[model samples]
Target: NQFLVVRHPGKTPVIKHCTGDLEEFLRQLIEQDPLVTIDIITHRYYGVGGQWVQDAGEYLHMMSD
Candidate 1:
């Protein structure tokens, strides 16, 4: 087993929505195999408008070799 880190852009001080490209990428990653774990690291800090900060956030997932 191995670990993978992925970063998705966030809407800071705004709507705080997930990007479509990132969503599709994650979907494809999951569909590619079985027995995988997906972890989403959401919101690391607070900006101006109560949005989550992710300038240094990360996501961890499982992969088989």
Candidate 2:
């Protein structure tokens, strides 16, 4: 098994921001292998004090046989 973490860019100046388009990416991945299980993890964080900070909680995504 393999793990795939896709950080779609949010509504930022960067087009790389996470968006719903990720579904398309995931769809293609699953289409390549019917035996594969696709898991979606939405990652998000807020900036504090002019600095981007992630809370103690960490986003997790894993894949295994």
What is the number of backbone collisions in each predicted candidate, taken in the order shown? 0, 6
Best by TM-score: 1
Per-residue lDDT over 1-65 for candidate 1, one digit per residue giving the tens place of the 0 to 100 score: 01233333352222223445554555565567333334443342564454332321133223212
lDDT of 2 by residue, 1-65 (tens): 12243333342221122345544445554467444443333334543443342211132221211
What overall lDDT goes with each candidate model? 0.37, 0.34
User: How far is 58's C-alpha from truth in model 2 (Å)?
Assistant: 22
Question: 56 in model 2: Cα distance from truth in Å?
Answer: 25
Please name the candidate that would achieve the greatest lDDT relative to the true structure: 1
List the candidate 2 regions with Cα displacement exceeding 4 Å: 1-20, 43-65
Model 1 has an lDDT value of 0.37
For model 2, state the Cα shift of residue 51 in Å: 22
All candidates: CA RMSD in angstroms? 11.7, 11.2
TM-score of 2: 0.30
